[PDB]
Design an enzyme around this catalytic site. Structure first.
Site, PDB file in Angstrom:
ATOM      1  N   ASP A   1      11.793  -4.265  -4.413  1.00 28.36           N
ATOM      2  CA  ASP A   1      11.647  -5.439  -5.333  1.00 28.36           C
ATOM      3  C   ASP A   1      10.456  -6.414  -5.034  1.00 28.36           C
ATOM      4  O   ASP A   1      10.477  -7.601  -5.383  1.00 28.36           O
ATOM      5  CB  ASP A   1      12.996  -6.188  -5.518  1.00 28.36           C
TER       6      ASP A   1
ATOM      7  N   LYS B   1       2.824 -21.545   1.741  1.00 30.20           N
ATOM      8  CA  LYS B   1       3.946 -21.596   0.771  1.00 30.20           C
ATOM      9  C   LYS B   1       5.122 -22.293   1.422  1.00 30.20           C
ATOM     10  O   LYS B   1       5.426 -22.016   2.583  1.00 30.20           O
ATOM     11  CB  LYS B   1       4.355 -20.197   0.236  1.00 30.20           C
TER      12      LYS B   1
END
Lengths: 294, 298
Positions: free
Chosen positions: B220, B116
């Protein structure tokens, strides 16, 4: 085969690391059919700046520069030097200091296995090499690697601690295993095919040099004394009394059979980068060494 | 033997060179007894300026930084990944666009690893969590549902910095994923039926994995879910190979993969992982909600 590039001086580890780097790099560029002109202007520069990593032998920051990598790969092949062999010679163990084999270099070194000579040189030495490189490469082609001229293998620039150092790698004029006991510098009795081939080369070489407009090169003569080589020992490839592999020790001639002491001679032209007209110097050179043999 | 690094874009050639270089370079630095504090702050940096030389696929001028070489080299050992395989997956052929991806990602040609592109802040955050993550990966013996980090780089090519993290693919490197779910904040709940061995094991992982993120004060993050529909694979993409069975997978290669139950609706492979570990209820609450939430899918 964990390669620690361990040496007495930082500068040598950097050399060992660069030769390892550039030879591996080249094992991934294809071998071209021909060399282009671009290859003679070419180079690769590499700046390293490690931080807290792999600093037990190398410094943390260095540069390494390889001049004309494609051309010296070719010259290595023409001299019958396999790249992996070169790589291992420079990297398996640290280069160890050597006696001088010319007026040219400020410092002479040998690879641990005494195969290749490493010479510290000036920047103007680097530049003169660039000037002669294409014709030299041409000459080495035409002559099939069979010269008395220095046979150039690599040329580098190392920076350690903001200090730049230029280096030229050549095949050792002397043996990788017989000691040269006496060196003579010339600005001896052999076999007849030896004398013939010698003088063939010498004319062909000296001619070349003159045509490049080069003077004030000399002949390095080294001598191995077999009887002394037995005697300095009294108090793994085989080889007998005054014996050598001519494909490795390419400047060696054995002394004539019906002749006094068994000796081995090493003759090579040295000092072609830094230093009557050149044509005159050439003709004189031929004739000087014609008388000196057998 | 003879790596050309032919990629479409020069950044990918630089990535392939870089990994090849840094792994090679690493085979010459000994595997250590123990990682020392400096290893978590170490880096390697290399600038190449070729002139009229090796301009075939590589650019002439490029830079390549690898963060914490010694941490990421060990991390790979810990996850059963030999450096030579890693070097191989990245260098034998160009990385390619991911069939899935994010908001987009790359995969190695063999679909084993994900690269990524990230930002400076991600790099910084990874530097924060790294020792702790390493401690964690030691204790959990590479058996996590967390992203399994393999290396981290910054390439500069043609004026531009690109940060990259490399992970083990969440999904199989061979089995097609037909249905993706991403289970976020407080989502797509059919429930998943898995083997006794598999469910017991999974719940054990998530337990300590979520415990870990909590203690670090990380919240989160989401649970990513992939489904390989076996019968659909057998129909749709029948004789794709000629032009491991039909939904059978290597557990040492596909570490997130689970088989559907012996007594189950249809033949299925599940891939589940925790994702978004880097970039107000409290984290121990999020931790608790999560363990509870994601257990009841099974």
């Amino acid at each position: 085969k964990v390669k620690l590039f361990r040496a007495s001086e930082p500068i040598l580890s950097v050399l060992m690391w660069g030769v390892n780097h550039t030879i591996n790099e080249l094992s991934n560029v294809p071998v071209p059919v021909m060399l282009m002109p671009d290859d003679f202007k070419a180079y690769s520069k590499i700046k390293v700046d490690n931080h807290l990593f792999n600093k037990e032998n190398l410094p943390s920051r260095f540069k390494f520069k390889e001049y004309c990598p494609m051309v010296f790969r070719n010259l290595r092949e023409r001299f019958g030097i396999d790249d992996q062999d070169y790589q291992n010679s420079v990297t398996r163990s640290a280069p160890i200091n050597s006696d001088s084999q010319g007026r040219c270099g400020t410092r002479f070194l040998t690879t641990y296995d005494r195969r290749f000579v490493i010479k510290t040189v000036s920047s103007e030495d680097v530049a003169e090499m660039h000037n002669i490189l294409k014709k030299y490469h041409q000459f080495i082609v035409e002559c099939h690697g069979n010269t008395l001229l220095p046979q150039f293998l690599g040329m580098y620039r190392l920076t350690v601690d903001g200090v730049e150092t230029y280096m030229v790698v050549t095949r050792n004029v002397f043996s990788h295993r017989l000691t040269v006991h006496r060196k003579y510098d010339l600005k001896l009795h052999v076999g007849e095919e030896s004398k013939k081939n010698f003088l063939e080369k010498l004319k062909r070489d000296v001619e070349f040099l003159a045509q490049l407009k080069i003077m004030d090169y000399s002949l390095l003569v080294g001598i191995h004394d077999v009887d002394r080589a037995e005697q300095e020992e009294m108090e793994p490839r085989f080889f007998g009394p005054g014996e050598f592999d001519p494909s490795v020790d390419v400047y060696a001639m054995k002394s004539h059979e019906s002749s006094p002491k068994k000796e081995v001679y090493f003759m090579a032209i040295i000092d072609i980068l830094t230093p009557v007209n050149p044509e005159q110097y050439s003709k004189r050179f031929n004739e000087f060494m014609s008388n000196i043999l057998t």
